[PDB]
Amino acid sequence: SWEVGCGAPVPLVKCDENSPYRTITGDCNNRRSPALGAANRALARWLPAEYEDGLALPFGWTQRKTRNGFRVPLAREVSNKIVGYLDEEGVLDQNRSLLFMQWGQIVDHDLDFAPETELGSNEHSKTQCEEYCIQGDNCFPIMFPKNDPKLKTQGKCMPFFRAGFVCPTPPYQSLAREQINAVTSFLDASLVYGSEPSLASRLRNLSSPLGLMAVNQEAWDHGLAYLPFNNKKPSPCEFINTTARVPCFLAGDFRASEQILLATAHTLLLREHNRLARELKKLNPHWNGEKLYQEARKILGAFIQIITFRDYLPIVLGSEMQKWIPPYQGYNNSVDPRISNVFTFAFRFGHMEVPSTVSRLDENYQPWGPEAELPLHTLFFNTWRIIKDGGIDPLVRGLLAKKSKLMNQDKMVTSELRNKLFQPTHKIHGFDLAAINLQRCRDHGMPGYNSWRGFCGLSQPKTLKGLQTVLKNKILAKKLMDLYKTPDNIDIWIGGNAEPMVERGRVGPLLACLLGRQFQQIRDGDRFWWENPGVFTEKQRDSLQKVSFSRLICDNTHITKVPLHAFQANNYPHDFVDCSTVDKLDLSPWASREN
Ligand code: HEM
Ligand SMILES: *[C@@H]1O[C@H](CO)[C@@H](O[C@@H]2O[C@H](CO)[C@@H](O)[C@H](O)[C@H]2NC(C)=O)[C@H](O)[C@H]1NC(C)=O
Ligand SMILES: *[C@@H]1O[C@H](CO)[C@@H](O[C@@H]2O[C@H](CO)[C@@H](O)[C@H](O)[C@H]2NC(C)=O)[C@H](O)[C@H]1NC(C)=O
Ligand SMILES: *[C@@H]1O[C@H](CO)[C@@H](O)[C@H](O)[C@H]1NC(C)=O
Ligand SMILES: [Ca+2]
Ligand SMILES: [Zn+2]
């Protein structure tokens, strides 16, 4: 009847109350409700889901059924008319390095993943949805509007499969459909260690009692470790280049090889675990492998939290940072730490920060070889350009010395993502991440733009002129009104990203509120927050305050010249220092004395 808890899956609650370490699943963090923030449960609903039929059909599903009296426009038509641009000149962020973009993706992948339903195992609709563009069950194809050039070269649609949902994926559940978060809601390095026990063990080196993560046994980066290969088929990293046949990496997170700089960041974090585990073994030779793994895992989780909340979030939220994330006042076990469904769309502001090219730079921060700069689309599921072209150092120098794309109301998403995206099992560099995001907002039953404005205490524009004023842009407001016909129908991904950025920040007021609230909750609601008294000793916390992405690079690469503020736009050599001058993480406070 009430159906308070639909929890047939993952019923197991076997909580050690005493454990100084996190579970891999996120279970037991909250003592009163131990499933809160656990992986493989429903995304939180801050507002009730909004479906065409009130339960699970997306707006746009039934041609005849309006939203508030108007047909919702095709995701791809919004993408073409609003999100696309031609000229990559002038589009770079003069005050954010490319590392700023890349850290956002890292944090996002630690916090949330809504994987497509697996109803494609030995299924026709796996290829049939792509082949015949026929909407049904989990097939919700992105149809091309009539004037779309892709209609001329790529057929009628782009394939799209509905996200997985809680209480059996194929059939009906208690009231509205709730999509799954497959990773831990805590900011806990689940993207390095995994959110499931099987994966987390596969990633470990259990051959030695050294608490190490498994490393590649077939390839080395000038003696430095690579992630292991994912030896499974079919492999998109092999598909791109069947001559090189270099597989995807195997990381804590499914998505680690989606692009070369994400793979690069994952590689830095793995190196850091093993570095930490080796340093701890020197300090504490009596520590067994499990203890070394847990202790290094706990430090790397703290590293990710401190970089995120001290360095990253202030330059995302700008003037809104203090409003939404006041200085820390300790653990609040009444806070809901779960990632919300809306946050998983709010955080996609990163899509508008991705620039059109990636560079490899040499030890003078000068172009590395004759093709030093490459188009982003050639680097989707690309591991062979790492193994076979110079390792991660040239790409890390690019992350430091090159710039994020700046979000621009006239230039939102580069064609490298908007027309050339590669999706596994599709075979073409032909997808549109903007269209996918809009279709997914509808898949997840998102409330529209004005419902979220109301949620955030902001004005709800009802007319062209009101929207013009909110967006500070008359042409953008007119295009959105021509497509939507009411600001109430504007999908949250495009409405949030259309707002001009807050002072000293990189998102508008609506996104600052949605992101701000989520990050407040993941900090306040986390029993294992690095700064929660008892988690670390006061001396440990004194050491941890000195972490920086600059030291992470110095410690885990052959790079000896780094900037002191790695998320800022930094130019070589003026903004760069020797690793010598950069604070180290002093692990002496981890020395464990019994006798
Ligand atoms: C080249 C860089 C990137 C690529 C190729 C990429 C690709 C993708 C793809 C294909 C999806 C899945 C879309 C769907 O099926 O609904 C996605 C989701 C997402 N992306 Fe990106 N992305 C990039 C950068 C970023 C950045 C920089 C951020 C944040 C700052 C970000 C945040 C997200 C979030 C939060 C999701 C939803 C995750 C989930 O809950 O399932 N991405 N991205
Ligand atoms: C697991 O860790 C062991 C212990 O370090 C690794 O084996 C060593 O392998 C390296 C080759 O990369 C050799 O240089 C050393 O001589 C070996 N040392 C010892 C003490 O055996 C093993 O490669 C690791 N396995 C994985 C999958 O990472
Ligand atoms: C597939 O990967 C191979 C293997 O690296 C790439 O070949 C390199 O190709 C260029 C020629 O354009 C040479 O100058 C390099 O020295 C090659 N190395 C080797 C070992 O062959 C090839 O370019 C890739 N093709 C695609 C489609 O990505
Ligand atoms: C604990 O969280 C609850 C619910 O979010 C909040 O209302 C309360 O004020 C919080 N406690 C403190 C001390 O901020
Ligand atoms: Ca996590
Ligand atoms: Zn080297």
From Swiss-Prot:
Enzyme class, first EC level, given as a word: oxidoreductase
Swiss-Prot/TrEMBL cofactor(s): Ca(2+); heme b
Modification 3'-nitrotyrosine occurs at: 365
Domain of life: Eukaryota
An example molecular function term from Gene Ontology annotations: lactoperoxidase activity
One Gene Ontology cellular component: basolateral plasma membrane
Residues marked Transition state stabilizer (site): 255
Positions that bind heme b: 108, 258, 351
EC numbers on record: 1.11.1.7
Main location: secreted
GO biological process: antibacterial humoral response; defense response to bacterium; detection of chemical stimulus involved in sensory perception of bitter taste; hydrogen peroxide catabolic process; response to oxidative stress
Tissues where this protein is expressed: Mammary gland; milk.
Keyword Mitochondrion recorded: no
Modified residues (Phosphoserine): 198
Active site: 109 (proton acceptor)
Cofactor note: Binds 1 Ca(2+) ion per heterodimer. Binds 1 heme b (iron(II)-protoporphyrin IX) group covalently per heterodimer.
Disulphide bonds in the chain: 6-167, 15-28, 129-139, 133-157, 237-248, 456-513, 554-579
Subcellular location: Secreted; Cytoplasm
Similarity-based family: Belongs to the peroxidase family. XPO subfamily.
Protein name, as recorded: Lactoperoxidase
Organism: Bos taurus
Gene (UniProt): LPO
Region of the whole protein represented: 118 to 712 of 712
